[PDB]
Amino acid sequence: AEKVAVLLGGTSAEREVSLLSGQAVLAGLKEAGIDAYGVDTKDFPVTQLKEQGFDKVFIALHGRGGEDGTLQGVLEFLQLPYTGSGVMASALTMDKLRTKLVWQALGLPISPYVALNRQQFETLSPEELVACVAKLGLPLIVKPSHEGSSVGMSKVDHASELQKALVEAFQHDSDVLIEKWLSGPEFTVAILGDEVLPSIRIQPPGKTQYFCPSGLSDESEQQLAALALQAYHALDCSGWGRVDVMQDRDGHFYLLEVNTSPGMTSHSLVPMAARQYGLSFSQLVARILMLAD
């Protein structure tokens, strides 16, 4: 039967979650009856998947080298069917700035923010950097533009803490965003093929608290689902994904980011939504593979 590669681990900051993601995906597929093998891409070169007898690919990597389009470009070249979003969408989902620009042009909601690159940083004075963000109010969140990890993110409460916050950020990326702070809570929406799965609310503790159903009204889930699907189609995603949305103090949803190769432990957001939906892990996992483009 079809020889399936589960790519796991890799070499990014999320190598550990990835090994776990992959071992799990592998179990699920087996249970579904699929003839799957796990490949640690820090030790086996993805280049050789073809050479090695694999017919299909299940991508379970995270961050640099798995959800950024480069692995995808490799696979398109070997002409191996694989799961998740293609080259353009993957790489796009990693560029938080370009993601906002596409969404804002479609009229989709995003929270106010300015963007700076390294060169304007080292050019503009502290004071001018402040004057430049004055209109976002305070507090702010400083996020480097490509990261997608947690590294580089500061909250900024007072305008004197801004320079420190930016220095910190730019040790990770040429681009950075200064975003207005929102109250939350946060909502995540798993998309599977073209089905939308029940939303999940997540929030700080009094570990991180997250729970399903979200508690949103039926009218609100429909609005949110709709928004999530526009957000995801706006980036040319497909296969499956997770759209993360931030709510504000007035109730309004803002878009955050689309994760195109989501965590898949059993602690993970996508499997939760999938359970609520009436899908076993194995079943969730098999469907993702059934969509391999």
Q: Can you give the binding site for its own copies, defined by CB under 8 A?
A: 45-47, 65, 68-74, 76-78, 87-88, 91-92, 94-95, 98, 100-102, 104-106, 117, 119, 174-175, 233-236
Strand pairing of 175-180 and 186-192?
unpaired
Q: From its phi and psi, is residue 184 left (phi > 0), alpha (psi between -120 and 50) or beta? A: left
> Of the two residues 70 and 280, which places its CB atom closer to its own copies in the complex?
70
Closest CA to 197 of 206, 184, 210, 188: 188
> Of the two residues 40 and 161, which places its CB atom closer to its own copies in the complex?
40
In the complex, minimum distance from the CB of residue 148 to its own copies, in angstroms, rounded to a whole number? 13
In the complex, minimum distance from the CB of residue 73 to its own copies, in angstroms, rounded to a whole number? 2
For 10, 168, 290, the CA distances from 2, given in Å and listed in that order, are 23, 47, 12
Any known ligand binding at 43? Answer: no
Any known ligand binding at 167? Answer: yes
Residue 90: both structure tokens together: 């993957």
State which amino acid sits at residue 155: K
Any known ligand binding at 196? Answer: no
In the complex, minimum distance from the CB of residue 60 to its own copies, in angstroms, rounded to a whole number? 17
> Of the two residues 51 and 127, which places its CB atom closer to its own copies in the complex?
51
What is the C-alpha R_g of the chain?
Answer: 20
Any known ligand binding at 159? Answer: yes
- Partnered with residue 186 across adjacent β-strands are 202, 246
Sign of the CA dihedral with 169 first, then 16, 275, and 208 last: negative
Any known ligand binding at 244? Answer: yes
> Of the two residues 138 and 229, which places its CB atom closer to its own copies in the complex?
229
Any known ligand binding at 267? Answer: no
> Of the two residues 101 and 290, which places its CB atom closer to its own copies in the complex?
101
* C-alpha 112 chain-centroid distance: 20
Any known ligand binding at 22? Answer: no
> Of the two residues 32 and 59, which places its CB atom closer to its own copies in the complex?
59
> Of the two residues 10 and 22, which places its CB atom closer to its own copies in the complex?
10
Breaks (C-N over 2.5 A) in the chain follow: 206
In the complex, minimum distance from the CB of residue 158 to its own copies, in angstroms, rounded to a whole number? 29
In the complex, minimum distance from the CB of residue 230 to its own copies, in angstroms, rounded to a whole number? 9
In the complex, minimum distance from the CB of residue 209 to its own copies, in angstroms, rounded to a whole number? 34
Peptide bond into 271 cis (omega under 30): no
Residue 166: both structure tokens together: 């930016």
Q: State the DSSP H helix or E strand holding residue 273, giving kind and residue range, or none if neither.
A: helix 269-277
Any known ligand binding at 95? Answer: no
Closest CA to 192 of 99, 91, 258, 274: 274
In the complex, minimum distance from the CB of residue 120 to its own copies, in angstroms, rounded to a whole number? 10
Contact 85, 236 (CB under 8 A): yes
Specify binding-site residues for Mg(2+).
244, 257, 259
Specify binding-site residues for ATP.
133-188
